[PDB]
Amino acid sequence: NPYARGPNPTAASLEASAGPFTVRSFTVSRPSGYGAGTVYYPTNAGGTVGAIAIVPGYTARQSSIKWWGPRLASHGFVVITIDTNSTLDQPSSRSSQQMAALRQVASLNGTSSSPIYGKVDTARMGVMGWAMGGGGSLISAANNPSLKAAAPQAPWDSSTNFSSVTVPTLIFACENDSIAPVNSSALPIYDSMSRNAKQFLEINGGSHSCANSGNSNQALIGKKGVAWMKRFMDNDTRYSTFACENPNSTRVSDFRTANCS
């Protein structure tokens, strides 16, 4: 597998705060099409790596989803976390901005003067995000089927029919979400997808911010996010077991998966 990076994983290595690669980061000087961004990247990765763009929810900023930057980058990805043009941007706008962030990562990859010149395989991209940013990630996936993976958290959109999504999609849900309730939001969205590899992981007792920075379930959430991205973005079947497993955990109140391998 030409995309495989790093050593064979274990549950403990995936549950730790960081993976095997050193992470460097920089703030984007001139954001193109979004408000602000921070790029996280691995050093001495052993090859080009995929890129992931992460967008927050309504009223929120990078801080809400920042943990994923070093968490994912340390396992071999270039990650861009963004602030939107406005904190009041809706899901469609968030999707457009998420794609603009991936675009800028691609721009930086091809620009001789950037720190990440030649570090990215621009044909391998992923999308993540929280709440309206989760809805945005799903819209991105629906409109851009070449994306290799999606892993939104506590997603919301005004529509729940995401049957057009063919991208491998993992949905993190928060059991006690009162903003985007699981039964009216995450679950119907999940249930609408009939054409892809998909997964649904619901966090026991979780509020709407249960997958955000500083959360108490980073061991599990981070393991699953990294495993999903590794399996689908890198086609790395060393991660199939972790990507597909139904975790035996009291931290999980519901688990669903389909077409996973």
Author numbering: 1 to 261
Extract from the study:
Specifically, I. sakaiensis adheres to PET surface and secretes a unique cutinase-like enzyme that degrades PET. By hydrolyzing PET, the enzyme produces mono-(2-hydroxyethyl) terephthalic acid (MHET), TPA and bis-2(hydroxyethyl) TPA (BHET). The enzyme is named PET hydrolase (PETase) for its PET preference. PETase adopts the canonical ɑ/β-hydrolase fold, in which the strictly conserved catalytic triad S131-H208-D177, as predicted from sequence alignment with homologous enzymes that exhibit PET-hydrolytic activity, is found on the protein surface.
We then used the inactive variant protein S131A to prevent ligand hydrolysis. Indeed, S131A variant showed very low activity comparing to the wild-type protein. However, attempts to obtain complex structures using the S131A variant, which crystallized in a C2 unit cell, also failed. In both crystal forms, the R103 side chain of one protein molecule penetrates into a surface cleft next to S131 (or A131) of another protein molecule. It appeared likely that the R103 side chain occupied the putative substrate-binding groove and prevented the substrate from entering. A comparison of the wild type, S131A, and DM crystal structures suggests that these mutations did not significantly alter the overall protein fold (Cα root mean square deviation = 0.144–0.2 Å).
